[PDB]
Amino acid sequence: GPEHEFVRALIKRNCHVITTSKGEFNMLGIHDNCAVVPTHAECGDSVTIDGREVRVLKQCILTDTNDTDTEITLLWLDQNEKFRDIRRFIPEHQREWSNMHLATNVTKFPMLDVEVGTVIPYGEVNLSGNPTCRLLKYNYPTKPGQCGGVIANTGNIVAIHVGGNGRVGYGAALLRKYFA
């Protein structure tokens, strides 16, 4: 299928396993040396990526105008490899999407690609006690080691998975203005 091809290509070319003191997360490269990770991974001055130690030159915890976490953190990595530039597939605004998939590659969930269905703008939810903004929501019983997983389909990369409650998943919205 062409969604499985676009999404598996994304995972293979741009995604990596990030290990912190808080566990294993999927890391999505966006462009150049800039990658996205969930803020609650609590990345330090260096991060373990695919088993190797990598210096973080700069990190930005992304936030709305009212200082509330999006749960997206940008990492600028000290690496020679340039990520394939996927900004053209990132939406400009929050929005409902049909036939979306969740994909990650992590020790609990190797090369996972799961149909999540319809994704909708949902706003602010408190995740583990912390207010989180610009969430998209899907009716799929996600599991915790899936954080950082990409929410996408052919040509559309719209969120990273950042939380769930056994019934529903929450994705932090990927907005092109984060990466300009």
CB 122 within 8 A of CB 143: no
In this structure, the number of other CB atoms found within 10 A of the CB of residue 118 comes to 14
Which position among 16, 43, 71, 161 bears the catalytic label?
Answer: 71
DSSP string, 69-119: EEEEEEEEE--SPPBP--GGGS-SS---EEEEEEEE--SSSTTEEEEEEEE
User: Is 101 designated active site?
Assistant: no
Residue 129 burial (CB count, 10 A): 5
Of the candidates 15, 43, 133, 147, the residue annotated as catalytic is: 147
147 a catalytic residue: yes
Catalytic residue status for 43: no
Q: Cβ distance 69 to 134 under 8 Å?
A: no
Catalytic residue from among 16, 40, 101, 161: 40
Q: Which residues are catalytic?
A: 40, 71, 147
